[PDB]
C-alpha cells in the first residue's frame, strides 16, 4: 500500500535497574561520559534521545558514540559528523539489546549504581545489557498467569504457582526495562536461574549481579524466554503442587505458556 516510512521519535532510554541513559552533568563536549542516572521528569536534553533515521541515537545534536571497537571501552557523547561514521551506529532489537554493528559489543551498564559509566561489552544478553526506549519511566506492574490459570507468586526466595488471588502477597510483578522480572515487594530481587543448564529450578535472588540468567522476554507464542541458553519458563512435569518452576527447551505445552494480566 506504501513504504512504511519511519519516524525519528524523541525518547529516553531506560535500562539496568530502571536508570536512564544520561549524559553526565549536562556537558556535551566531545568525549563526555554517557552514564546511568535516575530518570528525570522534565525536558532536559541530556536524557532525551532522538532515534534518528540513519541508525544513530542523538541527544542534543551529538551522537551516542563508542570510544572504540573493543570490549571495555566506554560510550561517550561526540560530534556525529566528526567521529567515525560507524562508531555512532546502533540498532535496537525487539529482545531489548542495543547493539553497535562494527563489533557485536552491546551498550551495557557494568554496575547497577548511579553515576556508573556506560560501556560496550560482549553480548551475553544480560540484565546489565537490556535497554528499552520509552518515555514511561516506571516499570510494568502486572500479574503473570500460567498453567491452569494460576498465578506466579514470589514468597521470599522461591517462585511457584498458586491459584490467583486479587491482592495476595505477592503475585504482582514489575517487568523492568532491562528484561528483569521483579516481585514488587522487594524491587531489588529478580527472577533468576543459576544457569545456563536445563532443569535448574528458578529462584528469586538479588539483581546486583545483573546476570544473563535474570533477563527474560515475553515472546509472541506466550512463552517467557531466558534470552540466553534458549530456554523458557517451564512448570516441572506440569505439576504446580511441586512448586518447581524450571527452565526447559521450548515445547509449547500449557506448562510453558504465560499471559501477563494487568
Amino acid at each position: 500500500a506504501d513504504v512504511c516510512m519511519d519516524p525519528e521519535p524523541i525518547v529516553r532510554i531506560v535500562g539496568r535497574n530502571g536508570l536512564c541513559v544520561d549524559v553526565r552533568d549536562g556537558r556535551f563536549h566531545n568525549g563526555n561520559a554517557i552514564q546511568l542516572w535516575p530518570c528525570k521528569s522534565n525536558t532536559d536534553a541530556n536524557q532525551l534521545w532522538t532515534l534518528k533515521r540513519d541508525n544513530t541515537i542523538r541527544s542534543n545534536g551529538k551522537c551516542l558514540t563508542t570510544y572504540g571497537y573493543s570490549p571495555g571501552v566506554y560510550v561517550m557523547i561526540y560530534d556525529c559528523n566528526t567521529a567515525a561514521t560507524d562508531a555512532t551506529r546502533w540498532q535496537i532489537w525487539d529482545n531489548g539489546t542495543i547493539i553497535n554493528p562494527r563489533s557485536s559489543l552491546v551498550l551495557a551498564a557494568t554496575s547497577g549504581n548511579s553515576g556508573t559509566t556506560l560501556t560496550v561489552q560482549t553480548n551475553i544478553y544480560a540484565v546489565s545489557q537490556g535497554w528499552l526506549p520509552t518515555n514511561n519511566t516506571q516499570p510494568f506492574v502486572t500479574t503473570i498467569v500460567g498453567l491452569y490459570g494460576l498465578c506466579l507468586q514470589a514468597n521470599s526466595g522461591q517462585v511457584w504457582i498458586e491459584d490467583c488471588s486479587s491482592e495476595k502477597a505477592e503475585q504482582q510483578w514489575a517487568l523492568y526495562a532491562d528484561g528483569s522480572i521483579r516481585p514488587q515487594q522487594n524491587r531489588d530481587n529478580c527472577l533468576t536461574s543459576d544457569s545456563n543448564i536445563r532443569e535448574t529450578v528458578v529462584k528469586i535472588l538479588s539483581c546486583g549481579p545483573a546476570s544473563s540468567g535474570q533477563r527474560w522476554m515475553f515472546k509472541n507464542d506466550g512463552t517467557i524466554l531466558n534470552l540466553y541458553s534458549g530456554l523458557v519458563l517451564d512448570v516441572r512435569a506440569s505439576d504446580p503442587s511441586l512448586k518447581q518452576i524450571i527452565l526447559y527447551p521450548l515445547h509449547g505445552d500449557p506448562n510453558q505458556i504465560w499471559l501477563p494480566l494487568f
Partner: antibody
Framework: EVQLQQSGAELMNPGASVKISCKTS????????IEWIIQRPGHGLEWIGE????????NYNEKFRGKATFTADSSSNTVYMQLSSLTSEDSAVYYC???????????????WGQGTLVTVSA | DIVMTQSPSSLSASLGGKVTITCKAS??????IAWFQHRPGKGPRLLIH???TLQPGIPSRFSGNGSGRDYSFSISNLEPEDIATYYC????????FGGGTKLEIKR
C-alpha cells in the same frame, strides 16, 4: 606493541583449503583486532577482513564472504585465516596486521606481518 | 559500501620534483584516511595516519591533507629511495584501499 609472525609459504591443490596463521606477541592478545590483506600481482592491496580474538566476532569484505574463515586460538595467542576452494586467483601474498589502539581515531593499520605466499598449482 | 578511486594509476617524476597523489571516496570519511608506502621487497609502511599528521621517522618532505571526500598526498624533495607503490586507506566506515600508485624515478 611488539610483533606478529605468520606461517611459511604454502602450495595447495586447486580446489582445497589452506589455513594461514598469524602468531601475535607483545600485546594483550584478547583486546585487539587482527586484520588480513591480500596482495596478488597487479591488484595492489585489498582488505579481506578482521577477527577479534577473545570474543570471536568477525567483519568480512563481501568479496571474501565464503572464501575466508577467520579463527583465533586463545591458548597459543594466534589467529588463523582459511581460504576454501582455492583457484589460481587465490594465489597471492596474504598479510596480517593490527590497529594501534582501541580506536576509533587509532585503529588505523600498524604492526604488519611479514606476509605469506599461497601458490595454487597442480 | 565505501569505494575509493585513487589517482593516478602510476607516474614518473624527475629527481627532487614534487609529486601529488589523490584519493576520492564515495562518501565522507570525515578526515579518517592514511597513506602507505609499499617499498619493493619490503612490507607496507605507514607515513601519514591522520589526514595530515605524519608518522614519526618519516621525512618532512612527505605531506597530505584533505576534507570530506577529496584528499591529497605530496612528496616534495624526491629521492631515489621513494620508489614504491603508494595507497590510500580510510578507516571511517571500514578499511578500503585505493588502487595504488607506482612511483618511478629518472636518471
Amino acid at each position: 606493541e611488539v610483533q606478529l609472525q605468520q606461517s611459511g609459504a604454502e602450495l595447495m591443490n586447486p580446489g582445497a583449503s589452506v589455513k594461514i596463521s598469524c602468531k601475535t606477541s607483545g600485546y594483550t592478545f584478547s583486546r585487539y583486532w587482527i586484520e588480513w590483506i591480500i596482495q596478488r600481482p597487479g591488484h595492489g592491496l585489498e582488505w579481506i577482513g578482521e577477527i577479534l580474538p577473545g570474543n570471536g566476532n568477525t567483519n568480512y569484505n563481501e568479496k571474501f564472504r565464503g572464501k575466508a574463515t577467520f579463527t583465533a586460538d586463545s591458548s597459543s595467542n594466534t589467529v588463523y585465516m582459511q581460504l576454501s576452494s582455492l583457484t589460481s586467483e587465490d594465489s597471492a601474498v596474504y598479510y596480517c596486521a593490527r590497529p594501534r589502539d582501541y580506536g576509533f581515531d587509532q585503529a588505523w593499520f600498524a604492526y604488519w606481518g611479514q606476509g605469506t605466499l599461497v601458490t595454487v598449482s597442480a | 559500501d565505501i569505494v575509493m578511486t585513487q589517482s593516478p594509476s602510476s607516474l614518473s617524476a624527475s629527481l627532487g620534483g614534487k609529486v601529488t597523489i589523490t584519493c576520492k571516496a564515495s562518501q565522507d570519511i570525515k578526515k579518517y584516511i592514511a597513506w602507505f608506502q609499499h617499498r619493493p621487497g619490503k612490507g607496507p609502511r605507514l607515513l601519514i595516519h591522520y589526514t595530515s599528521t605524519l608518522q614519526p621517522g618519516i621525512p618532512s618532505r612527505f605531506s597530505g591533507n584533505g576534507s570530506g571526500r577529496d584528499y591529497s598526498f605530496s612528496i616534495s624533495n624526491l629521492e631515489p629511495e621513494d620508489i614504491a607503490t603508494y595507497y590510500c586507506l580510510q578507516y571511517d566506515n571500514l578499511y578500503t584501499f585505493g588502487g595504488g600508485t607506482k612511483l618511478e624515478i629518472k636518471r
